Design a protein around this ligand. Sequence first.
Ligand SMILES: CC(=O)N[C@H]1C(=O)N[C@H](CO)[C@@H](O)[C@@H]1O
Length: 645
Amino acid sequence: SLQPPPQQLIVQNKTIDLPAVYQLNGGEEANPHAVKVLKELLSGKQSSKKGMLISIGEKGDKSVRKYSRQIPDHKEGYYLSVNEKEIVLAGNDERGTYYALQTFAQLLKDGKLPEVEIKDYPSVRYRGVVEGFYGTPWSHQARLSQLKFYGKNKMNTYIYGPKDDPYHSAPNWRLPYPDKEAAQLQELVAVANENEVDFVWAIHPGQDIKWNKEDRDLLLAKFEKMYQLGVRSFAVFFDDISGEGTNPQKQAELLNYIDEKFAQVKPDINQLVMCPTEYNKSWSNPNGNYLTTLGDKLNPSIQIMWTGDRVISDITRDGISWINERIKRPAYIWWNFPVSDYVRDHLLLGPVYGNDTTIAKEMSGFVTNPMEHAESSKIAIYSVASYAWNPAKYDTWQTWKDAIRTILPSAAEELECFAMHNSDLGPNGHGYRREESMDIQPAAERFLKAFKEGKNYDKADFETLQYTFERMKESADILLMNTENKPLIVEITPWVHQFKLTAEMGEEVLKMVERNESYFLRKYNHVKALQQQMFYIDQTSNQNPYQPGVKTATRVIKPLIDRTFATVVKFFNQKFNAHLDATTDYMPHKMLPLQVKANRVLISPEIELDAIYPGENIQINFLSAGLQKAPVKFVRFQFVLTIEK
Ligand SMILES: CC(=O)N[C@H]1C(=O)N[C@H](CO)[C@@H](O)[C@@H]1O
C-alpha cells in the first residue's frame, strides 16, 4: 500500500530482484539527497558498467533524456519505472527526484521490486505540520524524528510555532534564541533541508506589538538572526490576540514590508505566510473589514492561513469558497487535529477524515496542528500527508492502518486496538467530536437497552464485549513492554495503564451480570478497587493546569461499563434488599458528583473531605473568599474549594 498513493500507477503483477550488479547513471548530477537514499538501498550491492541500468536525475539532466516526456509537468512531480531491463527515477525537479526515491523505498521488500510505472505529483503545493499548539513544545529529539518522517511521507513543510516558546511569542519574540537553542534550531534546519522540508520559522508578536519603527526593526532583526541559523521560510502569526495588534491595515503593511525588504531581497527565501486574527468563520466578522482588507492589501505571494468554519473544524467546499472570496487567493489550511491542547486528558489516535477530497485547487497548503505528544501524532500526520498529496484517492481507514503498521510494525494490531478506543475528544467548548469504538457500538447499545429493560440480551453481544476486554488487556501489556519505539510508549503509557484497568473493570462487571450472592459481592468489591485505581491514575499522571488526568475509551466502552454496573447493583439491591453503592467514579470526599482536579475539590456545575487540609480559597458562581491556610474538613453553604495538597 503506497502512501501517499501515486496519481497514476500501472502494475504488471510480476516482480524482479533488486539488481546485485547495476550501472548507475546520473549519480553526480541528481539531487544529492535522492542519491544518498538510493545508495543506502543498494548497499552491499555494487556498481559497474555491466548489469541493470538505474537512471536517476531531474528533467534536463543527461541521465533522464529518454524519459523527458514521461516526467509529469508539475512541481515535485516524478516518473518512476521498474521493469526487467532498467530502473528509472526521474524528477521534474530536485524535490521530485527525492520523492521518486521515497516511493521506490516503499516498493522494495525482501530484495525484490514489483514491475511498475508511476507518474506522480502532489495535488496540494504545501503539505505538512504546524507545531503550533499550547503545552510542552516538542523535544529536540522528537523534532529530529518528525523531520525524517515528513521526508518519507512527502511532506515539504514544517512550521515552527509552539505557543509556549518564549522566543516565539510575547514578549521575548524580540530576543534572539540563546546559544543552546540556536544550535538546536540550526541542526533542525540542516536536517529539514536533508529531508526536503521547508523549515518555516513563525513569530507571534501581535499581543504586545507596537506599530512603530522600534518593534518593526526588532522583528526584522529577529528574522535576520533566524536567517543566519539557516532558516529560509518565515511566518507571522496574529491568532488568539486582542488589542492594537489586531489592526488589519497595519498587519498587511508589516507583512508587505517583510516581503519587500527581506523576502524579495535575500537570494533564497521560499515561503512567507501569515495567520490572521480572524482565522476561522466563527471568529470572523462578516460585516467587518478585516478579511477583505487583508485580501486587498496583502502582497499576492503572501499565504493566508485558515482553520475552517470554526476554531476546530473540517474543511468543506462551501467553507473554503467563503474565505477565498474575501482573501482573494486560495487559503493555506491550518487543520486543528489532532491537537489536544484543550482536551489534554485525551489522546486522539483515530483516523483522519471529514475534509472534502475534491477541493485541492481551492487550497495553497494544508498543515496539521498535532498533539504535544509527537510520536502519537504520527498516525494523523502520516494520514494528512497521504490526504494532501492525493486527496482524490484518500482512503481514511486504510491510511490509518498503514500509519500504525509503519510506526509500530512489531505490534501493529495492539496499537490499532488501543487507537481505535482512543479517538474521541469528549465534550468540549469547541463542539468537536470524533467517532470511537464504532465496531462494537451496536452490540453495546443493544446489550445495555435490553439489560436496563429486563429483556434478555443476545449472548453474542455479551461475548463481543468479553472479546473486546480481553484484547484490550493483551494490547495494553504488549504496548507497555514494547521497545521498538520507546518515545511513543513513554507518551502513551499513562493512558495504556488506564485502558488496561478499563478492560479489567469491564470483565468484572460482566461477571456481575452473570452466579450467587457471595460471588457477586467479590466482583463488586473488585470493581470498587479498580475504580479507585483509575482515580489514582487520573490524579497522579498528566497533571497539567487545564485538563489534568487520563481518560480513555470514553465514547462507548466506559459508559457501557458504568451503566451496566449501576444497573446490576440496582438489581442486586432489589433482590437482596441491600444498599450497595452504585456510583461509578471513585470519590474520596463526600457531599451532582464531586470532582477532584489538582488541589481543587468541586461540585459538578455540605462537603466533607477525607481529612483536614489547609484551605486556600473558595470560589462560587451562581464570589470568592481567601481561607488563609485555615484547617478545613467541612464546607457548608461553580463551587470550588482549593486546598493545600
Ligand atoms: C490558528 C489557531 O488555531 N490558533 C490556536 C487555536 O485557536 N486553537 C488551537 C487548538 O486549541 C491552538 O493549538 C492554536 O494555537
